Design a protein around this ligand. Structure first.
Ligand code: CL
Ligand code: CL
Length: 129
């Protein structure tokens, strides 16, 4: 599913990501834009052989099981395909675990390079939240 910007903002808010671990909702919408263009089906292979899945490009080296990343953890205890659903619950629940691990949203390289330090509130401007 390719979410609309406000559509994804409302879904994230309803799932309690807004202000989670101190990250206002625009941070999550900005990260999702650059990680996946709001497309739940996005997948990308990493150089180490792991793959990133879903709206927040959650990786199989640590967080989900895709059956092909040797030496892996599955810290969210889910198949990586659950992160590609039109229902973003699994992506949100797993993102909450990732952002609570010590490095905050710096775990998402695209958030650090393209959202951190920018006016991230602009990502939810005009949305009826
Ligand atoms: Cl915001
Ligand atoms: Cl933090």
């Amino acid at each position: 599913k390719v979410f609309g910007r406000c559509e994804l903002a409302a879904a994230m808010k309803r799932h309690g990501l807004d202000n989670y671990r101190g990250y206002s909702l625009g941070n999550w919408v900005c990260a999702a834009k650059f990680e996946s263009n709001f497309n739940t089906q996005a997948t990308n292979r990493n150089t180490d052989g792991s793959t990133d899945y879903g709206i927040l490009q959650i990786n199989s080296r640590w967080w989900c099981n895709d059956g092909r990343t040797p030496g892996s953890r599955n810290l969210c205890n889910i198949p990586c395909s659950a992160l590609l659903s039109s229902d973003i619950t699994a992506s949100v629940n797993c993102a909450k675990k990732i952002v609570s691990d010590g490095n905050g949203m710096n775990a998402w390289v695209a958030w650090r390079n393209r959202c951190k330090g920018t006016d991230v509130q602009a990502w939810i401007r005009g949305c009826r939240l």
